[PDB]
Amino acid sequence: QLQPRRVSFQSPGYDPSRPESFFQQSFQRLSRLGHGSYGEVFKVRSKEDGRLYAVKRSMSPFRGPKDRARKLAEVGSHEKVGQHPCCVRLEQAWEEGGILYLQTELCGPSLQQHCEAWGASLPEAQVWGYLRDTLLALAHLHSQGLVHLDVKPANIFLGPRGRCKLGDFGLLVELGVQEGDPRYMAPELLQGSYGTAADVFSLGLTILEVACNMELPHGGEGWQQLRQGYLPPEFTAGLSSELRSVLVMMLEPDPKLRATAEALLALPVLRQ
Numbered sequence: 466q467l468q469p470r471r472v473s474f475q476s477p478g479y480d481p482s483r484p485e486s487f488f489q490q491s492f493q494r495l496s497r498l499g500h501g502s503y504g505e506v507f508k509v510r511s512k513e514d515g516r517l518y519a520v521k522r523s524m525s526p527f528r529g530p531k532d533r534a535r536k537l538a539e540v541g542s543h544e545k546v547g548q549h550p551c552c553v554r555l556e557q558a559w560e561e562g563g564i565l566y567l568q569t570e571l572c573g574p575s576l577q578q579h580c581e582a583w584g585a586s587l588p589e590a591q592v593w594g595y596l597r598d599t600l601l602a603l604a605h606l607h608s609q610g611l612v613h614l615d616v617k618p619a620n621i622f623l624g625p626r627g628r629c630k631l632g633d634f635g636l637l638v639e640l641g642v643q644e645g646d647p648r649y650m651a652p653e654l655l656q657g658s659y660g661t662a663a664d665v666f667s668l669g670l671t672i673l674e675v676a677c678n679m680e681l682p683h684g685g686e687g688w689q690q691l692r693q694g695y696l697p698p699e700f701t702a703g704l705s706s707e708l709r710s711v712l713v714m715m716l717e718p719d720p721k722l723r724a725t726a727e728a729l730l731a732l733p734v735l736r737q
């Protein structure tokens with residue numbers, strides 16, 4: 466019959482019998498953190514060990530072999546990243562009934578959620594720490610030839626004491642493939658050319674969005690203006706000379722000239 470199988474590249478409180486699924490039997494749904502076409506994310510306490518975790522499950526069963534391989538790839542991308550202080554850590558993953566489950570550590574609200582609740586520009590002190598934490602994460606990914614390709618506030622999750630972690634590695638590619646959010650896409654991605662530089666540009670717009678409380682454009686003339694090498698004067702007025710200068714480096718239209726994550730972390734302004 467149907468049974469959950471581990472996905473990688475047993476739990477008391479769950480009996481192979483009974484109609485309830487492994488997720489329903491071996492976990493306690495505390496609350497729903499999000500839901501969408503991807504599926505649903507729940508904050509849960511596991512009947513196995515009682516600790517707190519976050520679990521993401523796909524919406525509908527696998528349509529076919531390619532849909533299954535695409536969904537399972539996020540687990541593989543998670544494992545290539547390995548454990549890192551600024552990366553959402555995956556505990557375990559399994560599949561049952563054509564549904565894919567990912568169990569990760571529990572984190573705070575997304576950077577998008579957190580900015581929504583405050584409804585204004587974040588204090589530059591918070592911005593620099595978040596910029597640092599994600600640059601540390603990007604430097605970790607880029608050192609292994611991995612490109613996140615979906616850096617945005619929704620995929621950055623806050624941690625205790627003002628820290629944050631990069632998450633959602635569903636679009637991660639290994640150099641040597643999927644549609645991203647156009648609001649945060651690097652200019653060279655339109656003409657193809659994939660590289661680690663794309664994440665730095667995406668992170669620049671995320672920081673530029675959260676530090677200025679500005680809504681990034683999906684397309685049109687405004688989309689182009691953010692990629693000519695200058696910042697919109699209206700929103701970027703409050704930026705300090707240092708922050709504005711770091712953003713200009715990250716928003717450098719030419720990927721050959723754009724600063725790397727390791728380079729930015731070596732700048733004077735960015736000090737642990």
Ligand SMILES: Cc1ccc(O)cc1-n1c(N)c(C(N)=O)c2nc3ccccc3nc21
Nearest residue numbers: 498499506519520521569571572632633634
């Ligand atoms: C479950 C999961 C799997 C892989 C990954 O990279 C991140 C998460 N994830 C977490 N680890 C989350 C958390 N608050 O701890 C969380 N919250 C989300 C809210 C809305 C939409 C998606 C979310 N996804 C989340």
